[PDB]
């Protein structure tokens, strides 16, 4: 289709230099920004008049001493420090497209990303230098290499001492609404690149502001990889549509007891992160560190367990409310702080999304059928959907189903339009003509004492062209027992709690299961070895 929204947009200025604005005016008092600590006892925090300045020294570094140009890529791969923030900023007011990426990554990502970008300039910190310069001098395009370090590097330019040498006036470029700011890699095959729009993040930001409950004296945690979507839409966009401020922990270990810690040593009163922040949190005994400042709680990324929600509600009195999205379309569905928390249930539509499930041929249906979630595109593509893969429109057009953009992902709608996420598409198995959901199988595997841990997925069979297969991980329990008869009675442990039809016609027994790092199985990592 097409969209509905002003010629111009630019987060930057429409937003960020409204509240330092504000500040210069005495119409509000200088309000926290970013207040980041690293755990160790250094902390920092700029207001909005110091981070407008900040970043419009960081544009400054970029659009004049790296001399980057409106629609010039920058990779950006550094950790959980302030020139994060600054640095996107930066190129939010120079309208460069920044294309986050992950300090874990190694040189073939990197060298993978660098290439299908042509990124003119990488942004990193110290951790990833030695893995950059590997492969930086295979990257035709990269011109500019910025380091973000207390340490000089022979080859790299300097960003803190060039941030501090540049001026704090920058003129924001009037930047088209529709106009590409953000790439993200996604994994769809081989890493596609999702260009994001000004308006896809900054507006579709500015219309979601508040889903949270954040208000803008507050302080928000948003816990994540500064190379995931989530740390532009929560830790930068959210707190700062609003005015309020981002709280950033490097946490350089994901230790769960520094952010109890930190949750019960600062004034926090909204945090974001995926489940397993919250697994891990219940994983301790909560009750040495209290958090009474701490009132809203959301989740993305995984389905947060009616269980998990539970215990949390339990150990600290507070809800969990989840929220839905891919890269394509960030916030997609959530459960906002007015609405009614359903466990298993990830919310409703954003933000002027109409998110509806579909059939095969693209038909919106009723409550209560399983069917493709997807968000209308036609005749009007709504603010916050990305503009297409890069270079990709035919897999843009693969994933557009009559009115739809398909998120890839089964699920049910209820009777008030809550959506059940029902998993990923791709995911089902297709056996001698029967659609088998890996969940139940998984889960009644899980019932039987030898299994830890299990990932259910399709096997390419001789005899009838797919077959269920699950991976098992053993109990130790078990690791004794005669493999042959342990598979045997997990089948008929199966066949036996479940549609016969469902049940492993193979089973594997291994030691691990390969997992993202927020802790979901990648079972197309499995499925894809699995068929030679
Ligand atoms: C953890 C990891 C796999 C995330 O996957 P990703 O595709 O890169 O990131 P996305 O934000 O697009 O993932 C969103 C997906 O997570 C799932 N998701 C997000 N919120 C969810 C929720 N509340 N409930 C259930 N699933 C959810 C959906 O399946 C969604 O659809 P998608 O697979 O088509 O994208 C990680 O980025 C990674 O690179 N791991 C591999 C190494
Ligand atoms: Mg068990």
Known sequence: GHQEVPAKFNFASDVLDHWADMEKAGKRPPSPALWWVNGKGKELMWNFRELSENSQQAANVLSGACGLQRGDRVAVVLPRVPEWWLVILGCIRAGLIFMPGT????????????????????????????????????????????????????????????LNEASTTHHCVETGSQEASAIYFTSGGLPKMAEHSYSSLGLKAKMDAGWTGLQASDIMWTISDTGWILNILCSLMEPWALGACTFVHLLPKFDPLVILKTLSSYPIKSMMGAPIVYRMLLQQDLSSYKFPHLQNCVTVGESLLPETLENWRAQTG????????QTETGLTCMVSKTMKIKPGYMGTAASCYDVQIIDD???????????????????????????????????????????????????????????????????????????????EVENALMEHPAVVETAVISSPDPVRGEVVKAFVVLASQFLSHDPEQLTKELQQHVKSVTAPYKYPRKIEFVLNLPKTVTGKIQRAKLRDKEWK
Do not use: H
């Not at 590997?134 to 395009?141: D, F």
């Not at 507070?318 to 999205?325: F, V």
């Not at 959907?385 to 009115?403: C, E, L, M, Q």
């Open 318 to 325: 507070l809800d969990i409310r989840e929220s839905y999205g």
């Open 103 to 162: 300090i874990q990554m190694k040189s073939t990502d990197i060298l993978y990303r660098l290439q299908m970008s042509k990124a003119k300039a990488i942004v990193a910190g110290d951790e990833v230098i030695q893995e950059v310069d590997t492969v930086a001098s295979e990257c035709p395009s990269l011109r500019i290499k910025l380091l973000v370090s207390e340490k000089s590097c022979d080859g790299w330019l300097n960003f803190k001492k060039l």
């Open 361 to 439: 041929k693209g038909n919106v249906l009723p409550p209560g059928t399983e069917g493709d979630i997807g968000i209308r595109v036609k005749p009007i593509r709504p603010i916050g959907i990305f503009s297409g893969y890069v270079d990709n429109p035919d897999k843009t057009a693969a994933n557009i189903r009559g009115d739809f953009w398909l998120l890839g992902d089964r699920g049910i709608k209820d009777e008030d339009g809550y959506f059940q996420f029902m998993g990923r598409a791709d995911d089902i198995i297709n056996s001698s003509g029967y659609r088998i959901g890996p969940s």
